[PDB]
Design a protein around this nucleic acid. Sequence first.
RNA 1: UGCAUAU
Length: 102
Amino acid sequence: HMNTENKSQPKRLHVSNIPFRFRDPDLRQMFGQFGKILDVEIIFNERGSKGFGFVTFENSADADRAREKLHGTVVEGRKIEVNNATARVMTNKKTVNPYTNG
RNA sequence: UGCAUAU
């Protein structure tokens, strides 16, 4: 009996040029039409909620296609960007070993 | 408030 975990897995997609009005539900309706959304982020600033964010798909299966369909769309008249995010950290902690053989 | 990676 081995680990037998899932394959597609959640991704953080960055979203940009979006109107100043867009929040959690306004971003997630735009991607969640293809599959399912877990969590959604909008960069938190001194002005309040910003015209820039991220979306957390349930699985890469819809995260891949969704960014492909949404990138180059002009939501609320603003040609957007969508790509895979940096998430929390760029200093990966998942695994380590003293050797590098095999 | 058009500030653009996770102030």
